Design a protein around this ligand. Structure first.
Ligand SMILES: CCCCCCCCCCCCCCCC(=O)OC[C@H](COP(=O)(O)O)OC(=O)CCCCCCCCCCCCCCC
Ligand SMILES: CCCCCCCCCCCCCCCC(=O)OC[C@H](COP(=O)(O)O)OC(=O)CCCCCCCCCCCCCCC
Ligand SMILES: CCCCCCCCCCCCCCCC(=O)OC[C@H](COP(=O)(O)O)OC(=O)CCCCCCCCCCCCCCC
Ligand SMILES: CCCCCCCCCCCCCCCC(=O)OC[C@H](COP(=O)(O)O)OC(=O)CCCCCCCCCCCCCCC
Ligand SMILES: CCCCCCCCCCCCCCCC(=O)OC[C@H](COP(=O)(O)O)OC(=O)CCCCCCCCCCCCCCC
Ligand SMILES: CCCCCCCCCCCCCCCC(=O)OC[C@H](COP(=O)(O)O)OC(=O)CCCCCCCCCCCCCCC
Ligand SMILES: [Mg+2]
Ligand SMILES: [Mg+2]
Lengths: 258, 259, 98, 261, 258, 97
């Protein structure tokens, strides 16, 4: 009935807020709650290799591909406007202030946002997390806390690597394939980057969405329902939500610095 | 005298009132078994392990009550019990050795060669001594539970509860022998929480039944075998139809079939 | 908790509780400090050991891996009740020289 | 005379030889129960006598002709003879309970949608899950999710029907199911193959119980004649006896030197 | 040992090609094998709902955001050069001829490429698929066939909707927010689009993505290992591969047509 | 397979096999064709019904939903032994007359 559908809609509405506040409390208890006995830097390293180092081939190959795409494309668009030697700054503007970090947030929400929700969500279904509180180790600090720190300090690094490989691949297709003058690429590139509005801009834009990408990826797993299908629905909710919180948050972050 | 007691215990999960004024009294040194799906017996385990805060009421475990202790003392109390969750609940990123050693490296700072002795003698007790090398997915289903039983008995808890022997005979036999050996040998309280009534009653000494929020009686396995409580005589035997309906609430076999 | 004493002539003397806490202290004051001075025929009797956990078993087990390392042979006496219970499990019976 | 026969049956799964020259003979009209250790191919042996998995070499004589030597248009036509009750139900999530139970009908048969409802309704009654003709398979408890799957199986009225892990996670739910698997047998006169490692209730309803181990059938017989066959492996399986042919301890070095070295 | 690591690497290398060929045989048996009794168009409609219609809010909101990002950004970079009217053409050209289909392949590999493998791999773990062959319905034709069809005929439609909403959102931020002259947006836009190299180009680039995304997303699930963790690893492998099959194939599709 | 005949005076006559195949044909030639002509006191006897499945039970159940719709009352006689076992598992045994 309509009165049933609207009640279900309002319930889903208020529940979405309830979850958005529960996630904030969860992030609080995870990041600055206490210091449980089982913690250390070995956890952060073990999680840094599973969240970043494992996600290295995907984003590197993707950055190479997207760079040879942006160059192979803008050259075709620049060949009509005469700004031919201006394709270098393009693969370093359309890949270093908005698309670099955005595509890195899309691939890091997909690989290490779905592989971090199906790994921290499958631990909840097999009682791997519940068997930690009964040992005495707060799972928010032993399991969730390292994953939150290996997302914060790996997605900006992955975005920088993404931008570097994309720029270099754009060079390798502009210069070696499309035959634009070699030195002009990097020259025209570096005179018009304006570090404080390109490099640091994209890096803050990557820290922002990257932090969000590993907060709504480590919470959706922690608050999934403990079943083989609850995990598989959470690992999809965390790709949807972490793609929206990459794109829309990139709009909110680019409206502040164009 | 009693390891665990639930004085006026009740639990609420999203205004659903899972429990309402239950009172279980776990006798120490004895294998007690609280069998019952809806009874949410697994949820109760958390309560008596203080993984879940009760709605109102206190759980007297080995003396003082759990929900009224400081976190630095609740953690210190956690040394008293271990949990043998079904399917192993084994840390995947850790190998079997570090898996069993995990409870040791948490509450204790022992030399890494002394931790090895306890992990080695603890894994041999369950028979999983040779697989100190593997990863928990390189282990078979039944064998994975045995390593978990060893992780639990690490630190030598005084009580231990194994929620869900299930979905596995030779393996189930070693497990049902170990849960009794660990009890009579170590003198530790065992709380076996499984639906498989037969083997539960086999090792249980004071078996409970939890249903629709309230403890539906309790007792020794034989005194519970013929308590004449319709629900409990329906649970303790097969008897497909009884207080719990065999048929779903349909409308009419004459009307719905013809109309 | 408990203490360790009476070395250099075997006859190692053990005090009351051997738990997770008193483990490393007893090992350190026994392992290198005591078992290095010992000569031979080492006997350790857990007479005044009234409560113990498996940490105590591993302590007695850590007392053997160094006497064997130091050549001289050791044996355990006065095995208390709870220690025997944990020793009546796996690799702590015939392994334990008593 | 025999519903299912496995003449020289063996199965490969990646040069692993799950089975090597086994020979089971399923008597029709009787609740036969096959079992063994966890990971012995119990569930894999089902996909063979149901021809969901092609055997390596050998034939499975099911209700007459053999399965792996039939045309697909006739193998499908044979599929009407057996239904499968998997553990956890194996219920189509996108379909509701009514269409779930009706699915085997709408496949092999073109019956009026009113006549099909009567067949679905009588089945769902026979298992007691008649009132929940409305729900989705996740709105059903774990115990009742299996009864509706059993009803889906008994739709089309198969002459044999296979139960993989029929009574895994139970006690009252397990009782109704163990009563239904016997009622469906004695009433419908259909061959039941209960295939679970849970020995007690299996032997309770079984009439000719098998044991499968490490690729080969480790004997078989009536539950009592199998109770004391004196076969060390089978006496170790039919009873608890933690230690026996299957090792209780794992392959490791001497414990004496284990912690010593 | 090194001799062990290299053997394991060669085994994975040959295993990859084995899977690459098994996937092709699977797609063959799914798309043109036979006509099983349980099939119909109702399956294709039910799938088109869960694959496309459910994936409609994600890609629409994302297209709006990426459009009001593209415009809000290119306006900033083009004002420096001096070209300002053309932001409607530049914003539309990047989205319609490339970034449109690419970001749609990234969000469709994430939402309907993970909720597809997870839905068809849970169908394998709970024996929902094995209980179909024993009924007599080929699951490749009843389960996989509609899912593949839903992907082929929904991701290009979602990409077109993505491009439309992105263009319109770029207008709504250029015109109503950034104050560029209204009519010039669409005018400068439509005189320099060259349909056969921007609309049909992006549409073929999106079709090519859909075939390679909905097939590595429907196979990853069908060939997962039947466990709550095998599914969660397959629903991550299908995001990684289908992002690498979007970016890389977009590089190979844009070399064909700049 | 099987056939249906002898209407217009009750005494409905049923032939051998009622399975999934012979279902819809028997229903169509009985449901509207036969049961519309019938007057009253309808008796159907499954005397020459030697093999049958649940499909057959649904058929006899497909014979009551319309006689009741057409007001006139029906009853079943000479029910096949195979149908009786199928009828016994279900709660529709009382429903059948
Ligand atoms: C006075 C209190 C009013 C309440 C305010 C709550 C609003 C926030 C939630 C929005 C409604 C969500 C309904 C869920 C839909 C559904 O069916 O539910 C579907 C899903 C979840 O359910 P599923 O299990 O079906 O996945 O819900 C969502 O998709 C969640 C939406 C998240 C959006 C919230 C954050 C947006 C932030 C931007 C806000 C600024 C606006 C800018 C414009 C000017
Ligand atoms: C000429 C050939 C075309 C080149 C590109 C072909 C496309 C496919 C290859 C891309 C790599 C696939 C990795 C998938 C990610 C994954 O497995 O996900 C990340 C995984 C994690 O492994 P798990 O399965 O244990 O989680 O990491 C790996 O172990 C992958 C190892 C592969 C490393 C090779 C790629 C590195 C650099 C790529 C080439 C450099 C480009 C420059 C050359 C000019
Ligand atoms: C994806 C592509 C998005 C934008 C790509 C390029 C944008 C404008 C294209 C050039 C138009 C000609 C302007 C001119 O006179 O020429 C402008 C200059 C030419 O200057 P010189 O000829 O003096 O060196 O080159 C450029 O086009 C500037 C750098 C391009 C980088 C684009 C900015 C980021 C866009 C992000 C969106 C994604
Ligand atoms: C004119 C139109 C313009 C409108 C623009 C709107 C932009 C809105 C931004 C989009 C963000 C969507 C978030 C999706 C999360 C969701 O659905 O939220 C829903 C989910 C849970 O929903 P469930 O009930 O389905 O599980 O939330 C979570 O699991 C936790 C996510 C919380 C993170 C929120 C992001 C806040 C970021 C704040 C940091 C900013 C730092 C900047 C400093 C410089
Ligand atoms: C004598 C009179 C003196 C004045 C003459 C000078 C006037 C001309 C100004 C020069 C500006 C210039 O160089 O450039 C001006 C040109 C020509 O005018 P248009 O804006 O109409 O194209 O504009 C552009 O460069 C259009 C930008 C389009 C960008 C498209 C996106 C690029 C990549 C897309 C895929 C990724
Ligand atoms: C206009 C022409 C028409 C175009 C037609 C489309 C072509 C179809 C291509 C098929 C793609 C393979 C699908 C495999 C199926 C599957 O599930 O494949 C799964 C298997 C993996 O097996 P596992 O399950 O063992 O991991 O293989 C893969 O991982 C496939 C990864 C796909 C990556 C695509 C990369 C292509 C881009 C190459 C660019 C290189 C350029 C280098 C220059 C420097
Ligand atoms: Mg439970
Ligand atoms: Mg099995």
């Amino acid at each position: 009935s309509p009165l049933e559908r609207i009640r279900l809609f309002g319930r889903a509405g208020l529940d979405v807020v309830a979850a958005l506040g529960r996630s904030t409390l969860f992030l609080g208890h995870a990041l600055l709650g206490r210091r449980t006995p089982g913690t250390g830097l070995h956890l952060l390293v073990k999680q840094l290799y599973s969240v970043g180092v494992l996600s290295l081939a995907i984003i590197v190959v993707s950055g190479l591909f997207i760079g040879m795409v942006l160059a192979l494309q803008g050259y075709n668009i620049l060949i009509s406007y005469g700004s031919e030697q201006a394709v270098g700054q393009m693969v370093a503007l359309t890949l270093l202030r908005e698309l670099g970090p955005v595509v890195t947030g899309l691939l890091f929400a997909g690989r290490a946002g779905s592989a971090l929700t199906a790994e921290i969500g499958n631990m909840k279904a097999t009682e791997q997390l519940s068997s930690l509180e009964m040992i005495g180790v707060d799972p928010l600090k032993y399991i969730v806390a390292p994953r939150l720190w290996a997302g914060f300090i790996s997605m900006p690094l992955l975005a920088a690597i993404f931008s570097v490989v994309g720029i270099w691949g754009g060079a390798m297709v502009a210069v070696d394939w499309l035959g634009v003058y070699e030195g002009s690429f990097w020259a025209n590139m570096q005179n018009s980057v304006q570090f404080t509005e390109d490099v640091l801009n994209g890096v803050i834009k990557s820290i922002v969405f990257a932090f969000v990408v590993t907060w709504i990826a480590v919470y959706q797993g922690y608050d999934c329902e403990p079943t083989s299908e609850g995990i598989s629905r959470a690992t999809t909710r965390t790709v949807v939500y972490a793609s929206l919180a990459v794109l829309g948050l990139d709009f909110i972050l680019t409206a502040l610095m164009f | 005298a009693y390891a665990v007691e639930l004085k006026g215990l009740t639990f609420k999960r999203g205004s659903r009132a899972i429990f309402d004024n239950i009172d279980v009294r776990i006798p120490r040194g004895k294998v007690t078994g609280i069998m019952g799906s809806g009874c949410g017996k697994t949820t109760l385990l958390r309560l008596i392990a203080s993984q879940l805060r009760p709605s109102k009421g206190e759980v007297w475990v080995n003396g003082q009550n759990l929900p009224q202790l400081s976190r630095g003392d609740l953690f210190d109390m956690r040394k008293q019990f271990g949990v043998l969750f079904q399917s192993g609940a084994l840390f995947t990123d850790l190998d079997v050795f570090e898996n069993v050693a995990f409870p040791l490296r948490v509450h204790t700072q022992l030399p890494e060669e002394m931790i090895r002795d306890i992990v080695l003698m603890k894994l041999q007790a369950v028979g999983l001594r040779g697989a100190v090398e593997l990863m928990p997915d390189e282990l078979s289903g039944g064998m994975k539970r045995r390593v978990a039983l060893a992780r639990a008995i690490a630190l030598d808890p005084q009580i231990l509860l194994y929620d869900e022997f299930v979905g596995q005979p030779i393996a189930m036999g070693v497990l049902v022998r170990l849960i009794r050996l660990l009890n009579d040998a170590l003198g530790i309280t065992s709380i076996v929480v499984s639906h498989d009534l037969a083997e539960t009653a086999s090792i249980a000494d004071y078996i409970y039944i939890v249903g629709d929020g309230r403890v539906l009686g309790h007792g020794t396995p034989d005194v519970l075998k013929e308590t004449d409580d319709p629900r409990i005589r329906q649970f303790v035997k097969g008897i497909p139809d009884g207080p719990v309906p065999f048929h779903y609430p349909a409308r009419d076999y004459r009307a719905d079939l013809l109309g | 908790q408990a203490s360790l004493r009476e070395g250099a002539a075997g006859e190692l003397q053990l005090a009351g509780v051997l738990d997770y806490s008193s483990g490393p202290a007893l090992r350190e004051q026994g392992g290198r400090l005591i078992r290095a001075s010992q000569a031979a025929e080492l006997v350790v009797d857990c007479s005044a050991v009234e409560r113990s956990s498996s940490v105590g078993i591993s302590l007695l087990l850590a007392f053997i891996r160094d006497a064997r390392k130091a050549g001289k042979v050791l044996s355990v006496r006065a095995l208390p009740d709870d220690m025997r219970e944990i020793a009546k499990v796996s690799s702590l019976l015939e392994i334990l020289p008593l």
